[PDB]
Design a protein around this ligand. Structure first.
Ligand SMILES: [Mg+2]
Ligand SMILES: [Zn+2]
Lengths: 55, 1321, 244, 282, 49
RNA sequence: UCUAUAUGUCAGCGUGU
DNA sequence: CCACGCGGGCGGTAGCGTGCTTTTTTCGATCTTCC
DNA sequence: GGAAGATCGAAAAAAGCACACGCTGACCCGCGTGG
């Protein structure tokens, strides 16, 4: 999962969709989803210490 | 015409009368030349690999600093020969090497001058080469890429014939179909609207596209409509009168021009009124004010006083609107000319319908249409619209597509750019509007001018281009990402996509099919086959019906007779004999041009489109000398129909009577006397015949057997003329003539015949020599007859003495009664070769290996096995025997390969393939030893020839020098070189010849070493498997009751009884008949050709019997010459002329020897022998002219009441053997899931009791039988065990139990989240 | 259950995997990922996307292609879901319940026997021996020529004269059902008394051919053995050619 | 006759794939030699027939499967419901041709009520007697045209039908026994001749060919100025009845059809009784 | 051949058979159009409870 | 019959209809 | 160069499709009919 | 005079496309990651 901040006017969505290594936009309905800035702020403060299944 | 040696061996008598003006072309040409265009070097980049490279290359990067370009390509030398690839299982292919130049630009310099250049050769996979016989070798198997009949790119106008709208109204559509891009459609909305559709998605108005093409409303109205000027005069605002606009309407107002009342108010305007108006030259006519509102203003009008638009474009005018316009002061207005039928207002209505009013809005709407769910961006919409149809890479129209597009739109030029243009779209829309208005006609889908043929080369080029664009994307990414210092052109591109796409196309494509090798005719038909099904084509289920019918354009291009019967009927066709493909892919046929009433010999190839314009006469037209039609009225085809025409109206004539039919139909004698259905079935059935023990030439033929035999690769054709130095059952060495010898060549050609090699249909392919030692040969003469070939003539079946009469009901519907003498002579005995494979693979427990010692096997079981663990060559093997002894560790469990139950035969060949790095078994060493011995002998023949020539030269030199021939004779042959002569030029030339001798010896040594290295190279196998052993078993299949046997006229049947020889009916001479056929099938099936063939065969056998009687009496050569000359000269102005006076009196003996069995007769497909000629031939021999003789009953012996029709007929043995169809099962394996008996004879399965059988059982009222068939026999495992135990005990009782299939269904439904269970209550 | 979705060995060291196993694996992986994301206290958008993708996977497993696009396999085609093996011509109902393959059955071409009677049909000796193997085993055990089933099997595969006599005796009045591939109506299957003949082709009565709509031009017909008393009586009294 | 006509006579006119008949027929025999043009013409019809035969089987199989399913649950489970209701049955009469007589349709069925002899009011047949060949002969000897019979659609039995309503077993002389599955038999009987069918998509006065009385049904006519009768109905039927009293010919006259002769007047063959204008409706 | 398994889904998932097979059972029971059901099911629009 | 030999689909066909 | 273990539409800095018929459901646009 | 129901043609989605048998090939995850 990635959070990309960009203006569709400067670069089109389909160009990002065709970028190598990117599977697809996370979209609900026809239009792609919009991530609010509050979620981005929380993620920038979101600092957990956990483990993973391979670990 | 002096016949060739193979033709002089046995000259077929020809009964044709029409002279031949064009010989039959090479049958396997369409497959060859197309592939040539795929691989031949082309300086102009429009065909094949060069075209693909020029389309893709050069490729740039994201930044203008580096560029990869293509220079040239070269096909490499294939690693293995065709035979080597076939025997080793590898794919016959040639390496492809491409010159790539990487140019690093000077980024510092603004001009971008070249900075560095790096040229290299890169390998981009293996391209599968195509053999000379028109077939491909993929994975060691023969495959054929059949052509595809598909709609040609361009514009096509069609209409639904009232199916939609539920009122019979016709809706018109126009489809632009490109070779590569997005299809476009313009459809008529029943409300008379225009709708544009892209890629068959939701419809949009065409005015949206027009606006997106930077066209305003005024421009659209100017293009799609005509303007009427309403100009305010001094009074009554007289307008520019055009009489043609007044047609088909009633003037509600009185017109006034010059003061004469041509038309009064309320009367319909007639043609006389229009003529009067035209004569009066009326230019201005008064108009009422109310009439203005009916019209629609064309151009937008603005008010100068108020600075506002008085009116926009394209809405209905109003009284207030015209009043405002008058107050504004505009003297003249322009309106759109509309009409009920002549000029429909479809464009205006479409402009009203759409919401878009500007180019940006139209582009946004188009982008939303094409890509839903994405943000509408002006730059993105513009880029998408530009790339949709105006980008060379995304959109491309081929030369054929552009030509069709220009021809449909009546454009003079036929060459243009692949990309679309605004003018093209406007012209297509205008043509659709005209078609709606009633001007023009819709195109025909089945028309052969609208359908083109795609051969193997075109599809290969398309697949290679797809791989090439993938590689171009990969190399673009690599160039953008990688550094600009140490990049090699080889490393940038990857050959994996190219190879993957190529192998997918050549092995997994639907059109790529397994080649059928039943007989040469089957191979010829398969190679010359056009299939509509395939990628980008019709589907079998949804093919429809109206396409399957025979179009009139099929004449001379597609044979209607030879089509498959079944689901794919009318979708697969056989190419005609003279049919060929044009440069655009459209089928064309030859014709003879007729000038000034005389039929010239000039040949013109006409396509479907051009044929319609001209008038072409039929082939069966009488012609006297100088090519003049002897009849005033000649039947000819003018435009999709046949009618009588005058002699001067004709323009072309059919080249020959065989133009219509294909090779399979043309090989059927007396086709014109046969029903079309029976002819079709016979043509389809001739391909399934299997080769017999001995090839017997057809007594009655069509003369096309030689062409089919020669064109097919089954036979051996001499490359150069010469004499047969050495003849053998395996190889033929021919010393070619001095004239045909290449400089510096030995001069001997070696042909290695293929002996007893399995075919794709498990049949036997064997080549037998047809020439003797010392017999001179010429180029193109057959040397060894292939399977089903007799002396260069196709021999599918055997000539049998047949008699048409009922015999105690043993014939009945279609069955055949066969004498025991046929089985005794082994006429229909066949050889079938079966391959069994044993795989030794490295399992995790331990690497299994082939050993002679097997756990728990008897000593007698291992008697056939050798020390190596393989069955001995030539050891008869029955069912259950062990062929290869393999053991798998557990200590070891047996895994030896055994033959399937019920399979017998004799082991004839054993092949061992071992992965490199693994030890070689001594059996493989022996196989390699024989291979190297054969190669050594083949090389040593040329070595001995060259050494003998060189030593003769040195002997002559030494004799000229010192004259010591006697000493050379006494001295050993090899010590001739060591002799020393006097110091002179003779010594120098002796040293030079010694140097040449040792150089030749070393060259032969390195050639032998290369051959040994090639044959000893380890085979490439799949991962995990280290050894493969293939064993070939030969089985003799003899005729027996149940075998399917047929003829060439669609008559088929199964053998009923092998009657004793004494039971057959016999004639006065006592000779019994071989085949008894029921006459009842002759009239109902309407196949009368078989009767005529029988009569002709009887006449031929009578002639042969007379020749045999003459030979047995040791008659002088003069009598035989006279009799054969009389027999050949018989006919009615036959074209064939045979002169025996120029046969050196020795070839006559050979001809009589070949004619003792019978006299072959060539009967053309539609120019065959008449009944009078057959009667004359019968009267030539001592046979009755009626064709019916009197026989006696074999069993009883009294006289038959009526004469019967007995003669000689060519009968074929079909590939439907009863032993291959009989199956029986009592108990065996069961499916893992459903616990039901398996299916198929190979798996020892049981017959399926389908739905219809269950319905029949329920209708019969039998309940216990149905339950036994449903539960105990199939599903109930406990029921199965209980039934078996009860039957073994002797009690016939059954328990119902519970079928497992219902339990599986219940479990599946439960797993679907739905609770289902059975209630006891 | 695993047996209804077996993992059949591929005989080349690999394993042929059914589409149901792939769908179950996808569902399990999605469920585990969603569980991990929920346990990680992920924000709203991520967990919503994970839940939607899990729902899509579940719908694909239950019925592939019903909504949205179907899941493509390794060879570029829609996978076979749970609902795909129930409905359709290849589903369980129309392939293993309405009709199924049966034992004690054979198939062979048909010839014409003019000497046969209306209630008789010709049968090959080897084919009859294969069809009536358990009856021959039982008769051999009862008579006493063999003591165990293995001895009877050896005697049958050895093709002794006593085996042929037993084969003659067992089917003296044992009808067999002859059927043609297109069974348009009830006359497509009829009961006949077998008569041993030499060869590999079934000899059919000429008169019944019109009932069978069969012609001796390569036609193939199947034969079934009624192996219980009730079925034998039903064939003799109802489906016999004389009664029709 | 057609096949021998083709064999020893000229083949005749053929049709294009669309359906139009080719102007020039085949004047050549199968014994003689057909030229390339005639064979090419015949190939159109041959391929059309072959494609029709190939494509008919799928629809025939689908239809017979649907028919088998729709009647798979119909078996006889009773002897007599006692219902007196049934279907009226008369010989099918249309145009100037009679296709099926009453005997063929009535044979092998039971009666619904006591059929009486015409003109005598005497019970010709009993109420619940199966009509075999002798009963059909007796019925046709008395010139009876209408017979009411018990039909399966009128069976009062629930979850099945009775034996009496079904009638004869049609495979044995006796009546149908209990337990026989008649739905599957009926579906198979309908679906069997499906292959014989074809899936292809291919006047101003009445003419009298026989002699008999004329009857008018559902008619309210008026005399015109010249005395001729003109009908004022849209459902006016004309019946030509033979001397024995049974209906022989049937026609449906259109609106505004003049009458040459009135009702109950004998007419001869070849005479025109009704004339009308189909182009316009007066 | 008889023992079945079960997977404990962390979140509920609607059955596709009762949802897409026209007429929709869930939509008919809730008396609401199918598109709103699809939107709420696939996390496109909230629904009040 | 859990005594041998105990898979599936896709594509191409062909046969009887 | 010998395992390996999870997402999966593929691949790409976009677009791919494109020749049937019948039945059922729903929607936009109108309409028309009133309370 | 605006809402309600209504209806009507048009667009989108779903289901189907006979049976039986015989033969051949072509798979039955690929790839970034790891050791
Ligand atoms: Mg047949
Ligand atoms: Zn009843």
């Amino acid at each position: 999962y990635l959070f990309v901040e960009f203006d569709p006017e400067v670069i089109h969505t389909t160009t990002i969709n065709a970028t190598r290594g990117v599977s697809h936009f996370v979209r609900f309905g026809a239009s792609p989803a919009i991530v609010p800035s509050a979620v981005i702020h929380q993620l920038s403060v979101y600092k957990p210490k956990d483990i993973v299944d391979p670990a | 015409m002096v016949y060739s040696y193979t033709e002089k061996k046995r000259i077929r008598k020809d009964f044709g009368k029409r002279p031949q003006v064009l010989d039959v072309p090479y049958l396997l040409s369409i497959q060859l030349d197309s592939f040539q265009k795929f691989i031949e070097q082309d300086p102009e980049g429009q065909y094949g690999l060069e075209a693909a490279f020029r389309s893709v290359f050069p490729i740039q990067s994201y930044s203008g600093n580096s560029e990869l370009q293509y220079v040239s390509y070269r096909l490499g030398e294939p690693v293995f020969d065709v035979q080597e690839c076939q025997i080793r299982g590898v794919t016959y292919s040639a390496p492809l090497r491409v010159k790539l130049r990487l140019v690093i630009y000077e980024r510092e310099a603004p001009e971008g001058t070249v900075k560095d250049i790096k040229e290299q050769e890169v390998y981009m996979g293996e391209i599968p080469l195509m053999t000379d016989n028109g077939t491909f070798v993929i994975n060691g198997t023969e495959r054929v890429i059949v052509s595809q009949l598909h709609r040609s790119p361009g514009v096509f106008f069609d209409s639904d014939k009232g199916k939609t709208h539920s009122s019979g109204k016709v809706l018109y559509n126009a489809r632009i179909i490109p070779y590569r891009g997005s299809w476009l459609d313009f459809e008529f909305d029943p409300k008379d609207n225009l709708f544009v559709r892209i890629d068959r998605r939701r419809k949009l108005p065409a005015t949206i596209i027009l606006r997106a093409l930077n066209y305003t409303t005024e421009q659209i109205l100017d293009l799609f409509f005509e303007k009427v000027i309403f100009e305010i005069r001094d009074n009554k605002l007289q307008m520019e009168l055009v009489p043609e606009r007044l047609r088909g309407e009633t003037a509600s107002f009185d017109i006034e021009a010059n003061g004469k009342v041509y038309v009064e108010k309320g009367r319909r305007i007639t043609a006389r009124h229009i003529r009067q108006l035209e004569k009066d030259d009326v230019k201005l006519i008064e108009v009422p004010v109310e009439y203005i509102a009916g019209k629609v203003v064309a151009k937008d009008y603005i008010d100068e006083s108020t600075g506002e638009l008085i009116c926009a474009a394209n809405m209905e005018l109003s009284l207030d609107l015209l009043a405002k316009l008058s107050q504004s002061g505009h003297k003249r207005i322009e309106t759109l000319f509309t009409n009920d039928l002549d000029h429909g207002p479809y464009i205006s209505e479409t402009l009203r319908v759409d919401p878009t009013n500007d180019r940006l809005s139209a582009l946004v709407e188009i982008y939303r249409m094409m890509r839903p769910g994405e943000p509408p961006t002006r730059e993105a919409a513009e880029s998408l619209f530009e790339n949709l149809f105006f980008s060379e890479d995304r959109y491309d129209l081929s030369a054929v597509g552009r030509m069709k597009f220009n021809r449909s739109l009546l454009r003079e030029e036929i060459e243009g750019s692949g990309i679309l243009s605004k003018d093209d779209i406007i012209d297509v829309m205008k043509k659709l509007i005209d078609i709606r208005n009633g001007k023009g006609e819709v195109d025909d889908i089945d028309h052969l001018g609208n359908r083109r043929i795609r051969s193997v080369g075109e599809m290969a080029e398309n697949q290679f281009r797809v791989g090439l664009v993938r590689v171009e994307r990969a190399v673009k990414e690599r160039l953008s990402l990688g550094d600009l210092d140490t990049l090699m052109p080889q490393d940038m591109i990857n050959a994996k996509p190219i190879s993957a796409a190529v192998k997918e196309f050549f092995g997994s494509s639907q059109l790529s099919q397994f080649m059928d090798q039943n007989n040469p005719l089957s191979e010829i038909t398969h190679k010359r086959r056009i299939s509509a099904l395939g990628p980008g084509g019709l589907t079998r289920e949804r093919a429809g019906f109206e396409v399957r019918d025979v179009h009139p354009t099929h004449y001379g291009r597609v044979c209607p007779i030879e089509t498959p019967e079944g689901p794919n009927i009318g979708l697969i066709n056989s190419l005609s004999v003279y049919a060929q493909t044009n440069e655009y892919g459209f089928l064309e046929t030859p014709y003879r041009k007729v000038t000034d009433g005389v039929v010239t010999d000039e040949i013109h190839y006409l396509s479907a489109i051009e044929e319609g314009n001209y008038v072409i006469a039929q082939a069966n037209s009488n012609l006297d000398e100088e090519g003049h039609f002897v009849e005033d009225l000649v039947t000819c085809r003018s435009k999709g129909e046949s009618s009588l025409f005058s002699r001067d109206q004709v323009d072309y004539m059919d080249v020959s009577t065989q133009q219509v039919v294909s090779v399979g139909a043309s090989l059927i004698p007396f086709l014109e006397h046969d029903d079309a259905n029976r002819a079709l079935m016979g043509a389809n059935m001739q391909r399934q015949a299997v080769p017999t023990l001995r090839a017997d030439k057809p007594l009655v033929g069509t003369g096309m057997e030689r062409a089919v035999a020669v064109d097919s690769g089954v036979t051996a054709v001499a490359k150069r003329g010469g004499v047969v130095q050495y003849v053998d059952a395996s190889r033929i060495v021919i010393k070619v003539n001095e004239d045909e010898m290449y400089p510096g060549e030995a001069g001997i050609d070696i042909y290695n015949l293929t002996k007893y090699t399995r075919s794709n249909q498990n049949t036997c392919i064997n080549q037998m020599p047809c020439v003797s030692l010392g017999e001179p040969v010429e180029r193109g003469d057959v040397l060894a007859d292939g399977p089903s070939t007799d002396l260069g003539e196709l021999a599918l079946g055997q000539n049998m003495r047949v008699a048409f009469m009922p015999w105690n009901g043993y014939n009945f519907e279609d069955s055949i009664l066969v004498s025991e003498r046929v089985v005794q002579e082994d006429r229909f005995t066949t050889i079938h070769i079966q391959e069994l494979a044993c795989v030794s693979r490295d399992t995790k427990l331990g690497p299994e290996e082939i050993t002679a010692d097997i756990p728990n096997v008897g000593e007698a079981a291992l008697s056939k096995l050798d020390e190596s663990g393989i069955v001995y060559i030539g050891a008869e093997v029955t069912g259950g025997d062990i062929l290869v002894g393999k053991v798998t560790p557990k200590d070891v469990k047996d895994s030896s390969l055994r033959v399937p139950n019920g399979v017998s035969g004799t082991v004839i060949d054993v092949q061992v393939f071992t992965r490199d790095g693994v030890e070689k078994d001594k059996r493989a060493l022996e196989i390699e030893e024989m291979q190297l011995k054969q190669a050594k002998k083949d090389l040593s023949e040329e070595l001995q020839i060259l050494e003998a020539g060189l030593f003769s030269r040195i002997r002559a030199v030494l004799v000229a020098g010192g004259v010591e021939a006697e000493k050379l004779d006494k001295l050993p042959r090899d010590r001739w070189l060591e002799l020393g002569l006097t110091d002179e030029e003779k010594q120098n030339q002796l040293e030079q010849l010694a140097e040449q001798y040792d150089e030749l010896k070393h060259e032969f040594e390195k050639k032998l070493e290369a051959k040994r290295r090639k044959i000893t190279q380890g085979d490439d196998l799949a991962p995990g498997v280290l050894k493969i052993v293939k064993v070939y078993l030969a089985v003799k299949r003899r005729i027996q009751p149940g075998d399917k046997m047929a003829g060439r006229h669609g008559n088929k049947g199964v053998i009923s009884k092998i009657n004793p020889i004494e039971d057959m009916p016999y004639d006065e001479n006592g000779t019994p008949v071989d085949i008894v056929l029921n006459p009842l099938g002759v009239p109902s099936r309407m196949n009368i050709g078989q009767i005529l063939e029988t009569h002709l065969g009887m006449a031929a056998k009578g002639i042969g019997d007379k020749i045999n009687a003459m030979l047995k009496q040791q008659q002088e050569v003069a009598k035989l010459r006279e009799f054969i000359q009389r027999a050949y000269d018989l006919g009615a102005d036959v074209r064939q002329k045979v002169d025996l006076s120029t046969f050196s009196d020795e070839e006559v003996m050979r001809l009589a020897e070949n004619l003792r069995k019978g006299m072959p007769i060539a009967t053309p497909v539609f120019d065959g022998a008449k009944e009078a000629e057959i009667k004359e031939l019968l009267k030539l021999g001592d046979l009755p002219t009626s064709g019916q003789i009197r026989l006696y009953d074999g069993r009883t012996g009294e006289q038959f009441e009526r004469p019967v029709t007995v003669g000689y007929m060519y009968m074929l043995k079909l590939n439907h053997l009863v032993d291959d169809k009989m199956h029986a099962r009592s108990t065996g394996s069961y499916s893992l899931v459903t616990q039901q008996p398996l299916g198929g004879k190979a798996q020892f399965g049981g017959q399926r009791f389908g739905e219809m059988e269950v319905w029949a059982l329920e209708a019969y009222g039998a309940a216990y039988t149905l339950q036994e068939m449903l539960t105990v026999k199939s599903d109930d495992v406990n029921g199965r065990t209980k039934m078996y135990k009860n039957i073994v005990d002797g009690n016939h009782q059954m328990e119902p139990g519970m079928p497992e299939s219902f339990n599986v269904l219940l479990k599946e439904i439960r797993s679907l989240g739905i609770n289902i269970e059975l209630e006891d209550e | 259950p695993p047996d209804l979705r077996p993992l059949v060995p591929l005989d080349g060291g690999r394993f042929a995997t059914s589409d149901l196993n792939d769908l179950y694996r996808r569902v399990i992986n999605r469920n585990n990922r969603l569980k991990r994301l929920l346990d990680l206290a992920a924000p709203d958008i991520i967990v919503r996307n994970e839940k939607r993708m899990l729902q899509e996977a579940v719908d694909a497993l239950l019925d592939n292609g019903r909504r949205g696009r179907a899941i493509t396999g390794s060879n570029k085609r829609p996978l076979k879901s749970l609902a795909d093996m129930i409905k359709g011509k290849q589903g369980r109902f129309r392939q293993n319940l309405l009709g199924k393959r049966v034992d004690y059955s054979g198939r062979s071409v048909i010839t014409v026997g003019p000497y046969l009677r209306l209630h008789q049909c010709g049968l090959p000796k080897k084919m009859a021996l294969e069809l009536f193997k358990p009856f021959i085993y039982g008769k051999l055990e009862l008579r006493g020529l063999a003591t165990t089933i293995k001895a009877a099997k050896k005697m049958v595969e050895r093709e002794e004269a006593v085996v042929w006599d037993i084969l003659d005796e067992v089917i003296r009045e044992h009808p067999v059902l002859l059927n043609r591939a297109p069974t348009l109506h009830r006359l497509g299957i009829q009961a006949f008394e077998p008569v041993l003949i030499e060869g590999k082709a079934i000899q059919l009565h000429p008169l019944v051919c019109a009932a069978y709509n069969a012609d001796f031009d390569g036609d193939q017909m199947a034969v079934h053995v009624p192996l219980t008393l009730e079925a034998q009586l039903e064939a003799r009294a109802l489906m016999m050619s004389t009664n029709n | 006759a057609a096949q021998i006509r083709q064999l020893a006579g000229m083949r005749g006119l053929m049709a294009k794939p669309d359906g139009s008949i080719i102007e020039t027929p085949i004047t050549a025999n199968f014994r003689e030699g057909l030229n390339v043009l005639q064979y090419f013409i015949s190939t159109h019809g041959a391929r059309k027939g072959l494609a029709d035969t190939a494509l008919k089987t799928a629809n025939s199989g689908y239809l017979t499967r649907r028919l088998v399913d729709v009647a798979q649950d119909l078996v006889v489970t009773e002897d007599d419901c006692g219902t007196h209701e049934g279907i009226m049955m008369t010989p099918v009469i249309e145009g100037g041709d009679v296709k099926e007589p009453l005997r063929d349709r009535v044979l092998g069925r039971v009666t619904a009520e006591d059929v009486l002899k015409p003109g005598t009011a005497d019970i010709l047949v009993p109420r619940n007697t199966l009509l075999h060949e002798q009963w059909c002969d007796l019925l046709e000897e008395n010139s009876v045209d209408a017979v009411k019979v018990r039909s399966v659609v009128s069976c009062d039995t629930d979850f099945g039908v009775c034996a009496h309503c079904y009638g004869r077993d049609l495979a044995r002389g006796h009546i149908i026994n209990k337990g026989e599955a008649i739905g599957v038999i009926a579906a198979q009987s309908i679906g069997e001749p499906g292959t014989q069918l074809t899936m292809r998509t291919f006047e101003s006065s009445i003419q009298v060919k026989n002699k008999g009385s004329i009857k008018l049904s559902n008619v309210k006519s008026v005399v015109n100025s010249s005395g001729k009768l003109v009908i004022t109905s849209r459902n006016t039927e004309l019946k030509l009845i033979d001397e024995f009293g049974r209906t022989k010919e049937s026609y449906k006259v259109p609106y505004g059809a003049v009458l040459a002769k009135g009702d109950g007047e004998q007419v001869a063959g070849g005479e025109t009784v009704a004339n009308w204008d189909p182009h316009t409706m007066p | 051949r008889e023992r079945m398994g079960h997977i404990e889904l962390a979140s509920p998932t609607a059955h596709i058979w009762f949802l897409k097979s026209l007429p929709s059972r869930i939509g008919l029971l809730l008396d609401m159009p199918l598109r709103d059901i699809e939107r709420v099911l696939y996390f496109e629009s909230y629904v009040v409870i």
